[PDB]
């Protein structure tokens, strides 16, 4: 695995992000954890692809063009901003607006979000 | 596993951080991944415990009271700041200063750092 990749155990639900890569295959509940590749699930793009808005001193990210649901059983678990060697994560809770604000200096950034039902999604400016 | 925990495979070097918990144990290279509990390694505290400094708009974190080495074989791989539901990480590289600046509004924060040789360390304000 490589740094920044997100893996999930489909049996018990553990989800982890790689901080340091290696050659070993991550395992949980007797099976290889699944790589959650971005933008691969068949889901509404207008509700899952992050929309990046440049603000003074940082970025505002919303999921998505159409506000994604934030219900107990279906919500955006976190929004992450990747810039240079920075990885900022904003965890969310059902009931909150599917958005996040990050104060950072970087012209080029990548925004990612994870939906408990529809998986991993990303956008970039 | 629980959110925020850091695990390492002592065989291949994979290191991951938990985003979503679960009941199954993380395994790699045929053995349980090691839980990297903070401040448990027998190393120089003055070089590993993060020192949190309040600055205008956020916090500056340095590792540690005495600058930790940043050599090819021994360096601080990243500095993380935890506040509310925010998890901000700054990955570093040999040759860089063992410090990181985070712009954030949070009265209570926890700063963590990981040394490739001496493990996981933390401090809080
Ligand atoms: Ca075991
Ligand atoms: Ca992270
Ligand atoms: Fe969804
Ligand atoms: Fe060290
Ligand atoms: Fe599992
Ligand atoms: Fe391994």
UniProtKB/Swiss-Prot annotation, chains A, B:
Sites binding Fe cation 2 sit at 48, 68, 74, 115, 118
| Cofactor remark | Binds 1 Fe(3+) ion per subunit. The iron ion 1 is coordinated via 4 cysteine residues. Binds 1 Fe(2+) ion per subunit. The iron ion 2 is coordinated via four histidines and one cysteine residue.
Record's subunit section? Homodimer.
Q: What protein am I looking at? A: Desulfoferrodoxin
Tell me its EC number(s), please.
1.15.1.2
> Which gene codes for it?
dfx
UniProt note: domains: Is organized in two protein domains. The N-terminal domain has a fold similar to that of desulforedoxin and contains a mononuclear Fe(3+) ion, center I. The second domain contains a different mononuclear iron center, center II, with a Fe(2+) ion.
Misc. comment: Catalysis occurs at center II. Fe(2+) ion of center II is the electron donor and is converted to the Fe(3+) form during the reaction. The protein sequence in PubMed:10617593 comes from protein overexpressed and processed in E.coli.
Q: Which reaction does it catalyse?
A: reduced [rubredoxin] + superoxide + 2 H(+) = oxidized [rubredoxin] + H2O2
Q: Spell out the InterPro entries in the cross-references.
A: Desulfoferrodoxin_Fe-bd_dom (IPR002742), Desulfoferrodoxin_Fe-bd_dom_sf (IPR036073), Desulfoferrodoxin_N (IPR004462), Desulfoferrodoxin_N_sf (IPR038094), Desulfoferrodoxin_rbo (IPR004793), Desulfoferrodoxin_SOR (IPR051233)
The Gene Ontology biological process annotation of the record reads:
removal of superoxide radicals
Q: Which cofactor does it need?
A: Fe(3+); Cu(2+)
State the function annotated in the UniProt record. Catalyzes the one-electron reduction of superoxide anion radical to hydrogen peroxide at a nonheme ferrous iron center. Plays a fundamental role in case of oxidative stress via its superoxide detoxification activity.
- Top-level EC class as recorded in UniProt: oxidoreductase
Q: Could you say which protein family the record assigns here?
A: Belongs to the desulfoferrodoxin family.
